[PDB]
Design an enzyme around this catalytic site. Structure first.
Site, PDB file in Angstrom:
ATOM      1  N   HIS A  88      -6.795  -6.402   1.361  1.00  0.00           N
ATOM      2  CA  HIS A  88      -6.181  -5.783   1.297  1.00  0.00           C
ATOM      3  C   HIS A  88      -5.488  -4.929   2.299  1.00  0.00           C
ATOM      4  CE1 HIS A  88      -4.268  -1.955   0.688  1.00  0.00           C
ATOM      5  NE2 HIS A  88      -3.857  -1.207   1.799  1.00  0.00           N
ATOM      6  N   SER A 129       0.248  -1.338   0.212  1.00  0.00           N
ATOM      7  CA  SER A 129       0.272   0.107  -0.021  1.00  0.00           C
ATOM      8  C   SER A 129       0.865   1.480  -0.293  1.00  0.00           C
ATOM      9  CB  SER A 129      -0.977   0.190   1.156  1.00  0.00           C
ATOM     10  OG  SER A 129      -2.210   1.234   0.681  1.00  0.00           O
TER      11      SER A 129
END
EC number: 3.1.-.-
Length: 255
Positions: A234, A89
């Site tokens: 995620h 990320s």
């Protein structure tokens, strides 16, 4: 500037470039440890705390060119000419930004569940609310903090991830700065194309690397290769570390 790091020598010398692991927002150098524990078998590993996270220095500035330079400063401090970078990320964005800043310092690149785009949304308001609630309360232990956070969040995994940074009744990350600079973190600064193979590992149950970001992704990483991990959110490495490692090694072996 120089970042706080945890370095470990390869258990076996194989003439491979060292690997630098870079965590995401609200994370710390321990977050990609699951990957480090396997990759250290044949690579020197460097786990870093991104600025304003873990025990790395604090700075009011939070943008990708800055975070990329931090990586360069860290490599310089360790006297490492070039390294392979794996980032999740926000950390993936810092690593992608590094290709534009100092391409000669990067060997291979892996970006976990992230795309080089400005998402133009707020996706952490409840997390910030939970974090602030803990700070306002009298909570000192992780259990006490968890109780308060569960009143704001219903994803136990996210709660536990954040709590890794709750030590001595204090958050390891710089909350005020992360909030102030949030638009820049979820945001992005377009970079020139990096004409080298790059591995992207999206979570099958995550919107971070969906089709609407494909054009921009390829414009910056023309030779991007994607390996979607089915049934993963995620934090792909936390849910399916084995699947993530299989993808990483296939790319590193480059057969």
């Amino acid at each position: 500037m120089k970042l706080n790091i945890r370095a470990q020598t390869a258990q076996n010398q194989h003439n491979n470039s060292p690997i630098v692991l870079v965590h995401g927002l609200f994370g710390s150098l321990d977050n990609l440890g699951v990957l480090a524990r396997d990759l250290v078998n044949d690579h020197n590993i460097i786990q870093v705390d991104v600025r304003n996270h873990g025990l790395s220095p604090r700075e009011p500035v939070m943008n990708y060119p800055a975070m990329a330079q931090d990586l360069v400063d860290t490599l310089d401090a360790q006297q490492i000419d070039k390294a392979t970078f794996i980032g999740h990320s926000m950390g993936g964005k810092a690593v992608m930004a590094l290709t534009a800043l100092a391409p000669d310092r990067i060997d291979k690149l892996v970006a976990i569940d992230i795309a080089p785009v400005d998402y133009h949304v707020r996706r952490h308001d409840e997390i910030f609310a939970a974090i602030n609630a803990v700070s306002e309360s009298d909570a000192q232990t992780r259990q006490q903090a968890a109780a308060i956070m569960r009143q704001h969040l219903n994803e136990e995994g996210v709660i536990q991830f954040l709590l890794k940074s709750f030590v001595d009744g204090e958050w390891r990350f710089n909350v005020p700065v992360l909030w102030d600079q949030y638009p820049h973190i979820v945001g992005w600064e377009k970079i020139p194309a990096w004409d080298h193979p790059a591995l992207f590992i999206p979570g099958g149950n995550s919107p971070y690397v969906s089709e609407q970001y494909r054009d921009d992704l390829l414009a910056q990483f023309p030779q991007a290769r994607a390996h979607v991990i089915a049934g993963a959110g995620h934090w792909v490495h936390a849910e399916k570390p084995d699947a993530v490692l299989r993808a990483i090694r296939r790319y590193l072996n480059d057969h």
